[PDB]
Design a protein around this ligand. Structure first.
Ligand code: 2JI
Ligand code: 2JI
Length: 115
């Protein structure tokens, strides 16, 4: 229920990113959460994803949409720091350094609006 940062301390989140660097070096550590004020979209089964570093952001948008099992009419947006990723056909590795959190995770939010 509670957001990831309310379930793990800063030090623990950093240690998890370090573990992922050692055990899955070619993956980007990603946290994907439903927007707090979201009414239309369901909650994802899981929140922590290890994304192969060559995957395009625009492809991740399509993957998460499929995982939510929506109907074709439902609006869906996947945002990194409030930037919609739908047309970002750039590898996740290339945005990781600039957009990552201080803990080393890359945080994303999904919603039925882009504000
Ligand atoms: C949503 C996470 C994600 C996104 C894109 C991906 N493309 C491939 C080949 C994998 C395999 C894997 O899970 O390592 C993968 C995982
Ligand atoms: C997360 C910041 C960021 C990183 C890479 C990006 N590449 C493109 C085309 C955009 C604009 C957009 O969001 O449409 C963008 C934004």
């Amino acid at each position: 229920d509670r957001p990831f940062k309310q379930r793990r301390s800063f030090a623990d989140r950093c240690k998890e990113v370090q573990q992922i660097r050692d055990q899955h070096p070619s993956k980007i550590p990603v946290i994907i959460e439903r927007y707090k004020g979201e009414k239309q979209l369901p909650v994802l089964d899981k929140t922590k994803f290890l994304v192969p570093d060559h995957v395009n952001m625009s492809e991740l948008v399509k993957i998460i949409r499929r995982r939510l099992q929506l109907n074709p009419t439902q609006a869906f947006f996947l945002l990194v720091n409030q930037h919609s990723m739908v047309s970002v056909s750039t590898p996740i590795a290339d945005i990781y350094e600039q957009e990552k959190d201080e803990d080393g995770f890359l945080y994303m939010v999904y919603a039925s609006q882009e504000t």
